[PDB]
Amino acid sequence: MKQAIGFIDSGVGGLTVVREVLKQLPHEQVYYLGDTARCPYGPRDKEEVAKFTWEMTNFLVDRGIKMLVIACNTATAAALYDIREKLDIPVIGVIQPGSRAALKATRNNKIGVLGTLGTVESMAYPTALKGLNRRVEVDSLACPKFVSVVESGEYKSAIAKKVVAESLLPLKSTKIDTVILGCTHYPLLKPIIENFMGDGVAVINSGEETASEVSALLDYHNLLDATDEEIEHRFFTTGSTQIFKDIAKDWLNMPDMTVEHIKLGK
Template identity: 65%
Template sequence: MEKQAIGFIDSGVGGLTVVKEAMRQLPNESFYYVGDTARCPYGPRPAEQVLQFTWEMTNFLLHKDIKMLVIACNTATAVALEDIRKKLRIPVVGVILPGSRAAIKATQNNQVGIIGTEGTIKSRMYEKMMHEKDREVQVTPLACPKFVSLVESNEYQSAIAKKVVAETLTPLKNNHMDTLIMGCTHYPLLRPIIQNVMGDHVKLIDSGAETVSEVSTLLDYFHLAESSESKTKAERKFYTTGSKQMFHGIASEWLNMDHLEVEQIRLGTGL
């Protein structure tokens, strides 16, 4: 009998940072991942379009009989989480609330920064979530629209990336924040550069990694977790709407997997 998989969806390769943490924390679980790289980035797109695209990825994975859905994209979480959660019978997890909780726990001076796509920053969902928990937290948001393209083009370790990150984060440099939320699952691939620019005194919060802890808790709560005693091998399947080769190159390096099963798929229209 096949294991039911956990489904992960993202606008591109960014959600792989969540999968990497999931592989570490939940080694017995099967994962199916959809990256909509052909239509990435989602950040500048209208909310209605992001909602449509997110549903298309969701429906694809529902046909794979997943047992839980992780929206591993901050923009899609901000736009689509509530709608999808209301309409599905399986648990649905987004990345914004776990990241918000972690930032409140981490900050010592109540000064928190958020970097994300235009869509995520415009939604103000991080501010809303944090202020529901603690009204004293001062939040400084900054849209970083060029970061996703650096990752999707596999230039996240390049000299260009260092220049773009340094220039983009300049408005945050003189701020007194001690905590910065990487509010896009693409951004952890740029983490060394972001940390270097912000300084070691600023704690970086990986919203995707924080999400996996919530996934683990929900698996136990709903009695969906796989046992280490299971004789069925965990599956790792990856689907992309864009270049199979580009996706494979980034995914195999980031996940440290030599034999990666990647399939190119087509979802709807609107390219």
């Protein structure tokens, strides 16, 4: 009768959300699916992204999940409303939780948003933020290089420092006191970004609030488990299981995990 929390993503970035779920909800089993054969999603057409997101959704629903996290900013924007309406389990994305966390952390209502070209172009974060607080001013900044620096493992190195300083220089001209990491890969750069931005700026890992919302929703529906003793996490990918496993076992401190290859769509 034990059921997983499902996570869907285009790749490995959603693992940063899983990381916070492991901390905050240690009794819950996680089923994660990264569609690495077809990432990036950012460049793709909304219809296509919804179709892909439904394929991933349907796969995890067949596997038995009691809640779904769309742990991808692009998929969250393209499909959240339709999936939430059609499924009878709770479904959330990462954008409303990140926005909430920013509104909690800000003191001057000047917020920065870092993300992919697609994310920043969507205006999803400004729309969420401003709907909650009309006084907020939001500066959005595309950071095209960051995903590569993280996936390639360079995110602690001298390269990351230079890439962060280069990319975020515009933000230094502002009085922003809060920066939302609006791409699930970006938490791996968080210490470097905090260093560049300085001690007056709160840097938001939206996985932390997302995990809290999962916990709250599970409680709200009386679905929280009491033990981790028969926990069997499962990781699924459409791309290379080895490349995925190599990253995941490091980010999640899980040397013994198993990654299942799957075939979706076409």
